């Protein structure tokens, strides 16, 4: 009661100091010095491919680094690897648990990860010599469902869980190398930096955090949103990122200025954002929505510059190729669509 | 160049051939979400009836898969969105043991009015009926301290009771049923239904009730297509 209240008031004064420093380092808004830049005009992307073959809703998807092969996870119990140029199914792996919520694709192209409501990350080997695709490893140790997972290389993987912690695993041994704690809600997404040194995590506490991977500690905290954060993605250069939340708003947070620079929202938009991504140059911010549509935002002028309306259910996942040529979308109507 | 094209087409053909069998087996099973309010002792009935447990049963050669979440955290507004395509949410209500009845009512009201579960039907099993029976027969374990409007409530001239019952136990059970049906009927946002029942560790034919209720759910889902 006594020490507790002294410590709470010390924390509140520290919050006041931090907010005062943030406001001190803020002198001009982003849209105040970029107002005269020429707009992107109109972005009219249309559907090139449509990948059929899933039976249930698609929860996740991940492009390969060769910008040709795509992975997708459906809640029917399937992990399908497509060749997007010819729309051929290269692989169809059956999962032990039907409730997969995420999937990843190693930057070498050898392995595939998937996890879900079983609190386990299964690692499958794709390039087995004279064999099929079988479970290479099973990473267990989380206490809640897996919401996201990304490879760092063929040996390390970072996973977000519903038990409010992130974990960095070594795949060979199968043990948690590092545990990232600090969030007070379900971590819903994560994003690796252009290099593999830092990452960002967004949770259901309306807060995002920056984590140094090599140490295991939280660098900074960003508290702009006012509801659950569902998606997060780094700006291409690595000195900013963007988040989408359930309050029907996207935000662009800065890493060196330590605040949010821009807000992407409207009045006819009252649906939450499910996924966000950046184009190769970083000028376009694509965001999927609960209203079955996707929006292309001018990341520097905060004007919406196009729509991707081709889905009949909730747009669940969104991904731009590493060369910036296509945009894959996956929805709850069991279809993957490539736009260009 | 051309040979890789043809080998890729062959691999895709084999993949599709297996996906057809998978689609055949997938449409035949019915997935049910067993969602107890907690502390409901429903482990006993799911015995007689680590992140998620699965229970398979079969009625009239129809296969049902019932899922129960195990090692999940307390908050459930995110992982429950996975169960919108489920054919039925089985909701086990720990009626007497307390204010757990109000917590079950609030959970049911949140599931009923959710945007994504707005098309899923709920099969409502009010478990632990005999515990409540002796509780209200004793005249000591009262629920009116939590529901003051319990008095002034009369069992209708309808609602046939069991001959091995007391008017007051029937009164309490129908009070709970109407408390849930108030929430069930007050909202028309989703085209879904609620099938309330009564059960305990005494009635072992609950899978027949689940079978009939899923049959009715599927009938009313088919009956939708003939309209616009």
């Amino acid at each position: 009661q006594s020490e507790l209240d002294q410590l709470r008031q010390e924390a509140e004064q520290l919050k006041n100091q931090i907010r005062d420093a943030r406001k001190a380092c803020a002198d001009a808004t982003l849209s105040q010095i970029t107002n005269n830049i020429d707009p992107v005009g109109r972005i009219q992307m249309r559907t090139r491919r449509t990948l059929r073959g899933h039976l249930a809703k698609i929860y996740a998807m991940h492009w390969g680094t060769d910008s040709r092969l795509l992975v997708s996870a459906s809640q029917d119990g399937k992990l399908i690897i497509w060749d997007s140029y010819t729309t051929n199914k290269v692989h169809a792996i059956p999962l032990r648990s039907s409730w997969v919520m995420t999937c990843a694709y190693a930057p070498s192209g050898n392995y595939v990860a998937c996890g879900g409501l079983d609190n386990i990350c299964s690692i499958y080997n794709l390039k087995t010599r004279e064999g099929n695709v079988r479970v290479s490893r099973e990473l267990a140790g989380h206490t809640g469902y897996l919401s996201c997972c990304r490879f760092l290389d063929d040996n390390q993987i970072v996973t977000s869980s519903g038990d409010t912690t992130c974990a960095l695993w070594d795949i060979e041994t199968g043990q948690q190398t590092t545990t990232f704690t600090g969030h007070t809600g379900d971590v819903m997404s994560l994003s690796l930096a252009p290099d593999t040194r830092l990452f960002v995590s967004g949770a259901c506490d309306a807060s995002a955090k920056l984590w140094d991977v090599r140490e295991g500690m939280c660098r900074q905290t960003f508290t702009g949103h006012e509801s659950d954060i569902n998606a997060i993605c780094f700006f291409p250069n690595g000195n900013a990122f963007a988040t989408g939340s359930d309050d029907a708003t996207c935000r662009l947070f800065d890493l060196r200025a330590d605040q949010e620079l821009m807000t992407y929202s409207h009045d006819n938009i009252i649906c939450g954002i499910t996924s966000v991504s950046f184009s190769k140059s970083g000028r376009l911010l694509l965001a999927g929505y609960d209203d079955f549509n996707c929006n292309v935002w001018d990341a520097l002028k905060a004007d919406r510059a196009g729509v991707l309306a081709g889905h009949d259910n909730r747009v669940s996942c969104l991904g731009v190729t590493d060369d910036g040529m296509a945009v894959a979308t996956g929805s709850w109507d069991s279809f993957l669509k490539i736009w260009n | 160049q051309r040979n890789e094209e043809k080998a890729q087409r062959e691999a895709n053909k084999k993949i599709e051939k297996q996906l057809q069998k998978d689609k055949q087996v997938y449409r035949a099973t019915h997935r049910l979400l067993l969602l107890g309010a907690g502390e409901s002792g429903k482990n006993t009935i799911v015995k007689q009836m680590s992140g998620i447990f699965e229970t398979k049963f079969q009625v009239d050669k129809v296969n049902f898969h019932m899922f129960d979440v195990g090692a999940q955290r307390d908050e459930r507004r995110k992982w429950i969105q996975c169960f919108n395509d489920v054919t039925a949410i089985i909701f086990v209500v720990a009626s007497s043991s307390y204010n757990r009845l109000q917590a079950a009512l609030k959970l049911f009201d949140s599931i009923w009015n959710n945007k994504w579960l707005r098309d899923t039907s709920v099969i409502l099993f009010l478990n632990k009926q005999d515990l409540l029976a002796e509780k209200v027969l004793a005249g000591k374990s009262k629920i009116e301290d939590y529901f003051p409007e319990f008095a002034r409530y009369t069992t209708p001239e309808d609602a046939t009771p069991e001959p091995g019952e007391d008017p007051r136990v029937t009164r309490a059970k129908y009070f709970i049923r109407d408390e849930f049906l108030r929430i069930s009927t007050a909202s028309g946002d989703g085209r879904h239904y609620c099938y309330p029942h009564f059960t305990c560790a005494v009635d072992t034919e609950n899978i027949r009730r689940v079978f009939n209720d899923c049959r009715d759910i599927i009938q009313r889902m088919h009956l939708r297509q003939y309209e616009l």
Partner: nanobody
Amino acid sequence: QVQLQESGGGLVQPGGSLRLSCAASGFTFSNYKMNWVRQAPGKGLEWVSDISQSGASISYTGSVKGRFTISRDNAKNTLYLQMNSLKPEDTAVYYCARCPAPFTRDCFDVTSTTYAYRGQGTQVTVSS
């Protein structure tokens, strides 16, 4: 930053009166359903009352119907609970909860043990 500050708790005699207030900052107060929950000594969190975005729909738990009255003012973003004719079963820590999504009619996790959009609570002891 979503901030909720409760005020007005304290000691009261049986049959007394109180008025808990809840000041909200960091979000559009007009878009969310609001709730009053409570935790009694030696028990768990239980729901007490809730009010919609306007005030047209208002609900109470059983043991407070007739006595408590919930209200909200969107002009200054404040939530009020007027507690009348208290009794020793009302001794608890009261919390002002906001349910997570705007423009919705459902509020899932306001009673969970580690909910994020809850306040710190005010103590209300009814003694003699």
